Amino acid sequence: GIPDLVKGPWTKEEDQKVIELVKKYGTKQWTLIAKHLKGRLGKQCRERWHNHLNPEVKKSSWTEEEDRIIFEAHKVLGNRWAEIAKLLPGRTDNAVKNHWNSTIKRKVDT
């Protein structure tokens, strides 16, 4: 046994730097990671800096799928906020309804 990359086995340590660089960089120059940690591919990471970001509409406020639904529910029934909410458990009719004139009132000043 003892294949290549044995004359210098990297670990979380060196990898810890890449994280310090990706953060200090913003995850744009993936070349750094690799260029930094050679021997192997600088991949196997995206699944953390690329697969993470996913906040809300305004933290606590509405969400994504929630925004869409409503944005794709008012065109299915109408001002049935009573129903719109019925879809998303948590908010009420007075919620979605307002949410319409809140930030979901784009199509108005056509």
Side-chain angles (χ1 to χ4, degrees), residues 91-109:
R91 291 287 174 202
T92 48
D93 45 299
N94 243 297
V96 181
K97 179 172 75 110
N98 207 290
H99 189 22
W100 217 228
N101 283 291
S102 302
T103 280
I104 329 279
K105 32 60 131 165
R106 254 151 280 163
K107 223 240 182 215
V108 133
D109 261 23

Side-chain angles (χ1 to χ4, degrees), residues 16-95:
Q16 90 105 146
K17 212 217 191 82
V18 150
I19 284 29
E20 206 176 46
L21 273 143
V22 169
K23 70 91 168 155
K24 208 203 88 275
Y25 274 36
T27 339
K28 216 89 240 181
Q29 275 78 237
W30 277 95
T31 249
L32 104 69
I33 293 91
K35 190 156 122 190
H36 280 239
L37 331 192
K38 232 73 198 123
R40 262 119 119 276
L41 268 285
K43 209 74 179 234
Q44 223 262 290
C45 263
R46 265 213 157 187
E47 182 224 56
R48 232 281 237 191
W49 254 292
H50 250 267
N51 299 238
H52 238 230
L53 206 140
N54 177 47
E56 246 191 44
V57 177
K58 206 192 210 164
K59 239 69 207 81
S60 223
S61 316
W62 305 93
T63 81
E64 271 280 305
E65 30 139 90
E66 282 228 57
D67 215 88
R68 273 236 71 179
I69 288 176
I70 307 182
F71 171 66
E72 79 122 63
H74 207 255
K75 79 190 265 72
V76 207
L77 331 104
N79 8 50
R80 263 115 142 157
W81 321 118
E83 307 257 36
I84 300 273
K86 272 175 176 160
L87 297 152
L88 305 300
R91 291 287 174 202
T92 48
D93 45 299
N94 243 297

